[model samples]
Target: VADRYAVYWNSSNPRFQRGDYHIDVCINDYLDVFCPHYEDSVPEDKTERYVLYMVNFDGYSACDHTSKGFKRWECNRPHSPNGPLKFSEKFQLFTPFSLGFEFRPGREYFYISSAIPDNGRRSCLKLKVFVRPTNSCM
Candidate 1:
């Protein structure tokens, strides 16, 4: 079984205005993050994009991904014209236990967008995630 979640990356919504979020998910779940990156519509000069940076505590505190040398994933970019106007990127949680460090249950994870939006009025998007035990396993 799989559990998936969705988060909109646009700032137009009131929830995104503050850009702070706390989410809880079970282990081995999936996260689907969405942003507006329609093709042939966004002029080069006016294109708006959001970058999702999975950062450490320092980066979250500073709202600066560079401080921790964290890698960033962009939510919006030019894609095939035939593809859907909006798209989502899937992030897997299964890697933590097998690849490297474990995503210990109840521990917090951080994600932020250092990129300032076109409005330049709101705060940066920040997310705190908690990895809980899956019902089936625990």
Candidate 2:
């Protein structure tokens, strides 16, 4: 039982604006229909890990809508515009997880998902996203 997970993004809405963001991380533990206690219970190897990252906020933007607004990007591993992820340091050991993001006139972007445990700690899943700005007037 060794785990770790990391994904980040923070914005506040003072006319929130950023650009070129695309991130994805995925995992599922349906060990033989449902974790039968693990130990590689076979379910196509009990689903492994997945990783992806593309964060390049060359012109970062975000104001405080209320407070607690600082992190705009953090995942690490040479990802700017798009690079690294051949295994992404093993994707934190994988275990029932999800993370996604998309940008580029796609109404900006935002994402949050969690459930990682193996020493590290994460359990967020309330999902809150806001995007609105596409009139070809950037």
Candidate 3:
């Protein structure tokens, strides 16, 4: 049998996840106490979107105090830099939860949107996700 699921960005979300990452809407709370790197780069405007974190254990916890769940992917930076750095061939769901959703199954960048709600409000950064689960990527 095949399984399928979809995630949609709503006006109430403030991040770029589709709930498949286990966190659809994430927020950065204590920058002064946590992310000093972003602190210097971002403006004093708490209503702006200027950061892009990840779904790693440290990133997830520091950025949103949550685990990566099962939607963890691998990525690499540029040694000298080329067309889009590098992306892993897999999404590697490492937990029982990973058994929940089906991902791209291959390295394919998605064309996501860069719009959101009226700043200082909901879904400042939004994205929608759809999953057509195969025979369990487990």
lDDT of 1: 0.61
**Would you estimate the TM-scores of all the predictions?**
0.67, 0.19, 0.22
lDDT of each: 0.61, 0.25, 0.27
How much lDDT does candidate 3 score? 0.27
TM-score-better candidate, 1 vs 3: 1
**Which is superior by lDDT, 1 or 3?**
1
- The sequence of per-residue lDDT tens digits that candidate 2 reaches over residues 5-118 is 222322221221233333332222111101112233345333222121222222122211123222332223223233222212222232344643223332322332222222
lDDT string, candidate 3, 1-138, tens digits: 222223222323433344323311111101110111123334534322222323333433333313432333212221213322222222333325634332343222221222222243222232222222343234
* Model 1 lDDT per residue over 25-67, tens place: 7766556666545567566555556767878888877776776
**Positional deviation of residue 127's Cα in model 3 after best superposition, in angstroms:** 4.5
Position 93, candidate 2: lDDT: 30
Candidate with the greatest TM-score versus the true structure = 1
Q: Please identify which of the two predictions, 1 or 2, would achieve the higher lDDT against the true structure.
A: 1
Pairs of colliding residues, candidate 3? 13-123
